[PDB]
Amino acid sequence: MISLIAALAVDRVIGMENAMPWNLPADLAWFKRNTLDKPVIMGRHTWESIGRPLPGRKNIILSSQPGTDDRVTWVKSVDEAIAACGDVPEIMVIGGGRVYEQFLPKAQKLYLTHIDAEVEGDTHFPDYEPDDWESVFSEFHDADAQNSHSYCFEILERR
Template sequence: MLISMIAAMANNRVIGRGNQMPWYLPADLKHFKQTTLGKPIVMGRKTYESIGRALPGRHNYVLTRDSHWQSDGVIAITALQQAIELEQLNETEELVIIGGGELYRLFLPFAQRLYLTFIDLNVGDADTFFPDYEPDQWQVSVESAHQADEHNPYNYRFVQFERR
């Protein structure tokens, strides 16, 4: 099974501030939905709480240290291996880690694919960052650049990387 990660980041690998994304980029939200729809997703508890609900059209796994934690529409797990084992039973081809920062750091060594959105934006007082993914270990398989427009206030690039 392919383990992948999807993230949007501003300059300097910023992905969050105060448990929120410090930008609104509709094109990236659409890209996220198109990329993850129909695939199982894994998120940390803080990410789940910032979203506030299970995302429809996907198996939602929430990784938490609290073995008693539960919420409607999600499967609580205490180890990524639990999600992998459950999805192998379903013959799932790809499992997508959607954040946050702690999950990205923990599982980057196991990821074979990255779906990254690079946003041309400087964010001050950031507290969450995407880990250094060592670009020499990755090969670009898909890339598209986009200019800011009336709906998307920043220049941005979608880049898909495959591990070498």
């Protein structure tokens, strides 16, 4: 099964030109916990912003162009990406906007982090109808000395 994982502010904003104005180490501990030892699919843009291959994960990058990094796998379409994952119990899709949009319709589960922040952004997570998903897990956290804003982790299963 395919799952999507993303952090979103109000308005489904997931990214902007510059770094986001927040610091959420807890969210990043969650992301890692949920993606480790699984293959992750991402768009060329997300990859550049990450910078290096995520450790302990099979990295598959989607690009219309030839790959410029032999440490990861480059594919040219959605179908190839899926096949590059092989026979695994769960494929994690990490972004960005374009990529989430293409995989949404094919995903069975969403691992979302709702951040209580209002920011200007230019990339949104795709609109989803809640009634189509069952919240199987949900846990709110207040901001703290380490996390600049409050947030809530939620796991959704496609009904």
